[PDB]
Design a protein around this ligand. Structure first.
Ligand SMILES: NC(=O)C1=CN([C@@H]2O[C@H](COP(=O)(O)OP(=O)(O)OC[C@H]3O[C@@H](n4cnc5c(N)ncnc54)[C@H](O)[C@@H]3O)[C@@H](O)[C@H]2O)C=CC1
Ligand SMILES: NC(=O)C1=CN([C@@H]2O[C@H](COP(=O)(O)OP(=O)(O)OC[C@H]3O[C@@H](n4cnc5c(N)ncnc54)[C@H](O)[C@@H]3O)[C@@H](O)[C@H]2O)C=CC1
Ligand SMILES: NC(=O)C1=CN([C@@H]2O[C@H](COP(=O)(O)OP(=O)(O)OC[C@H]3O[C@@H](n4cnc5c(N)ncnc54)[C@H](O)[C@@H]3O)[C@@H](O)[C@H]2O)C=CC1
Ligand SMILES: NC(=O)C1=CN([C@@H]2O[C@H](COP(=O)(O)OP(=O)(O)OC[C@H]3O[C@@H](n4cnc5c(N)ncnc54)[C@H](O)[C@@H]3O)[C@@H](O)[C@H]2O)C=CC1
Ligand SMILES: O=C(O)c1cccc(C(=O)O)n1
Ligand SMILES: O=C(O)c1cccc(C(=O)O)n1
Ligand SMILES: O=C(O)c1cccc(C(=O)O)n1
Ligand SMILES: O=C(O)c1cccc(C(=O)O)n1
Lengths: 245, 245, 245, 245
């Protein structure tokens, strides 16, 4: 299988390049970063692309890829409904082309979101603390926001988090994501971390995920790269490839 | 519903007394502690008993209760397979009597055991750190041991935790519970806490439960007290009620 | 020693009442809550008062107390420079009257602030996560804000926390306290908790303090109540009574 | 300054090689791993050596180095009183040779040991949880053991940790280090982590250090490499350099 990487010089992208290069069943056929022509892709007869670039360019790369029938495994963040729709649109005229977009490729993260969904209804309180390296441009993380969305949707019909806050400094209570507070920590020394906190009378549940290293994202990505053509169209999240094995 | 409490003066037992006393749909009909006659139960027309006493006396109280058709919600620890056995044969002669024994009545704890079951097969490593107040007689906790049992059974067919330990002080690596290391911390200021740690390449998943207070055990207990007669015979665990596992 | 309590029916105040009542060397001589006359104090010949009330009334109570020469141990939050000054003022015409105001009376909290002061200069990043029960009116806590102040002052002359945040939801990055981000979590089941996070290349230092119970504030308070008259005037913080024994 | 590295191919050693190579004021003059002659050191005019090898070979390398007047910055673990002894008598015959041995070169770790020293006397309980990658041969870590030693010495004259344990699985309570329990976790995905837990009535203090990456040990090592000759003879610990203790 001929695999190309968009964002090859990036913190994550370079890690994927080594991963592909080292995979016995994959041929690294393209290494693009900022300012490299996309035809390098079509030129090396790339079959699938791993994209870890930027919210400002991903839709550009996606149109090209789908246009040329190249499958895409996308980790780049910032996707929205309209974006998904756009993708969803684009892919309609391009059947047999698969695009997989995951807010996080680490298994612990995927499991965390799963568990949070399950625990949400049993508690009175839920907040999300997210912790990342100081080079991350967006806060809160997409993973954190998506996790707040899931908790909120799972608690439909229940009252809101109890909060007697009457005076506070702006921002102390974090960002409101569908009524779930989300706090973003940007600290040197960190990579990617998230804590989901549930509380009720006299007890709390914490689901914590820690990416100590960017290699943590490779198994998930390569798993997707390999079974990409199984589900043609648009897949979101890794869950579909996991709640099997 | 007439509810009696065994271990009424205990750290947990007294909390249950207040809880029952305050429940609008329950009548506190008995308060027994060490040295109180069991007939105080039968004497007050008790229908259900909450037992938070001691491993050395629970079987004694259980025989009496079943004998007199009183239902039992038991939180007292130290139950074993053989123990689970006597209570059954005791009930067969007293069908229509229900006994519920739960290693933990806090919801977060029950959910933690559920999640650990689900995550076990996705990681190379699993260890359990358990933390309790310095008055706890047994280590590791029953909750921790049961959680190690579940993780082990969920990983049947997979290799053991990788460990290159070649020299160590005795005990440094914790207790072996079905091949899952369990560490017991006994510290002033704590109540009841447990951490489940899963690890694989470059990432870890931690499910942490904290009982900051003994009130955390009341909802679970009262839930069981109320639906006790829904299942005649023995019920081990709170799972069946929480409609999950 | 005749001790009176302001805020006697409060979450913390009631705990202090039991504490005083149980102290063999203290006489509980007054129990005031909202709507009780202050002369109850002067009426019972109170010598020292413990105040755990509200930012809106503390200055009122303080004027009376100082006016009548009653010493005050104040845990109520929301004090400011002008307030301190005001107190500082007031106390000038009232020598031999001592007032002790502490942002936190738990020893671990006092130690945490001490340690943070010491570690601040060794790291590139510092953030503060504070976690409290959902009845707390103010965010961030006074302890958290004071801790951010100390870290900032200890890092004078060093560059700011590195942060590449370019897009973010409002509040995701917390409150800015002297350039130190502070995040406030309000969750059911919690009492009073704080985490100080320091980060540099490939490592982090976390100093975590947990008040699992409001009794945690009693030793500190009673220590202050007893040695109150040692330092006449205004003392802030418990440190002066600790960096001895 | 001509710097050589012993254990150049090791997890940590290779990281030091890159660090030296990249330092503008240091010349990488030697790269030895298992089976490389020590004369490669003397051969390249090496002035200082960084040793991250193995307890079984460090004394061998130390004799050679001191013998030839090469300074040594040693991170390799397993040093003991008797060991500390040979190196001294070796140096007496080679004054002007400096040897620095540190159980940990990460700053957060050094600070953690400092703080634990300070907090020890204020609590009733102290335990140490240490967490490392599954390739570590020794448990508990030297850092953890040294930290338990310090806490114990700081609590001389005080009673022991209160523990009502009466029945337990072997090892559940950890290793005894001078009466301080130490627990060693070996988990995939981890690098080097330690938690110090102090507890007293209703509260706990936790000092947590996390090395998410082996780069975390470079600043400390290079700092020592550079000022090595400031102190002829033996220096145990990084404390003397950090101007603290
Ligand atoms: N879904 C997941 O599991 C994960 C998602 N991410 C996300 O993936 C992205 C990458 O993060 P990092 O690697 O830390 O960023 P980075 O520091 O690597 O920045 C992105 C890289 O891609 C390059 N690139 C930029 N524009 C490009 C273009 N138009 N075409 C091709 N290459 C281009 C940039 O030059 C740079 O090399 C971010 O949005 C991040 O939040 C990161 C880790 C995991
Ligand atoms: N399943 C769960 O969720 C939980 C289980 N437990 C377990 O429940 C038990 C109680 O824990 P604590 O309250 O902390 O202990 P405790 O020692 O404070 O409470 C036990 C009390 O019951 C009394 N009692 C003893 N023998 C009795 C007898 N023959 N008849 C009536 N009362 C008797 C004792 O004098 C004492 O008052 C232990 O086995 C503990 O491990 C504790 C918390 C939660
Ligand atoms: N410094 C420290 O270590 C600590 C400080 N606090 C702070 O102390 C205060 C108390 O917190 P909680 O006990 O949770 O609040 P709370 O829920 O007890 O509210 C305060 C109580 O004082 C009463 N009171 C109100 N106005 C009064 C007045 N004018 N005169 C006399 N009594 C009055 C109220 O009726 C209520 O009983 C808050 O500002 C809290 O943040 C809380 C714990 C520790
Ligand atoms: N003080 C500190 O801050 C730290 C100390 N350490 C300790 O440093 C040592 C190294 O740890 P790792 O790098 O993880 O182990 P490792 O086994 O990955 O590194 C050791 C390496 O040195 C090689 N080597 C062995 N014998 C040698 C010899 N006679 N001459 C030259 N090279 C030789 C081995 O082949 C291997 O390449 C251990 O004792 C570890 O506990 C590790 C991290 C930090
Ligand atoms: O969901 C996210 O935004 C996310 C997840 C992991 C890592 C990163 C990152 O390094 O930016 N971002
Ligand atoms: O599983 C247990 O043994 C357990 C769980 C919660 C509390 C206690 C306890 O307080 O003894 N014991
Ligand atoms: O510094 C604070 O504001 C603080 C500290 C401990 C407890 C509380 C509280 O219960 O409000 N508030
Ligand atoms: O104190 C120790 O033994 C220690 C400290 C940090 C890392 C390692 C290691 O990687 O072996 N060992």
């Amino acid at each position: 299988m001929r695999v190309g990487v968009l964002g090859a010089k990036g913190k994550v992208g370079t890690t994927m390049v080594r991963a592909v290069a080292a995979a016995d069943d994959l041929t690294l056929s393209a290494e693009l970063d900022a300012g490299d022509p996309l035809s390098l892709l079509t030129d090396g007869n790339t079959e699938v692309v791993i994209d870890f670039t930027h919210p400002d360019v991903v839709m550009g790369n996606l149109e090209f890829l789908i246009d040329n029938g190249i499958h895409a495994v996308v980790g780049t963040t910032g996707f929205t409904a309209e974006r998904f729709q756009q993708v969803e649109s684009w892919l309609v005229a391009k059947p047999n082309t698969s695009v997989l977009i995951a807010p996080n490729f680490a298994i612990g993260a995927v499991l965390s979101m799963h568990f949070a969904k399950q625990a949400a209804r049993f508690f009175d309180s839920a907040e999300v603390i997210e912790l990342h390296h100081p080079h991350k441009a967006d806060a809160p993380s997409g993973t954190a926001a998506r996790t707040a969305k899931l908790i909120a949707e799972a608690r439909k019909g229940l009252p809101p988090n109890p909060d007697a806050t009457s005076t506070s400094l702006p921002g102390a209570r974090g960002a409101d994501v569908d009524g779930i507070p989300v706090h973003a920590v940007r600290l040197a020394g960190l990579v990617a971390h998230q804590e989901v906190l549930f509380g009720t009378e006299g007890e709390t549940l914490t689901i914590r995920h820690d990416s100590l290293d960017r290699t943590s994202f490779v198994p998930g990505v390569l798993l997707a790269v390999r079974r990409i053509a199984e589900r043609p169209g648009l897949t979101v999240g890794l869950e579909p490839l996991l709640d099997l094995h």
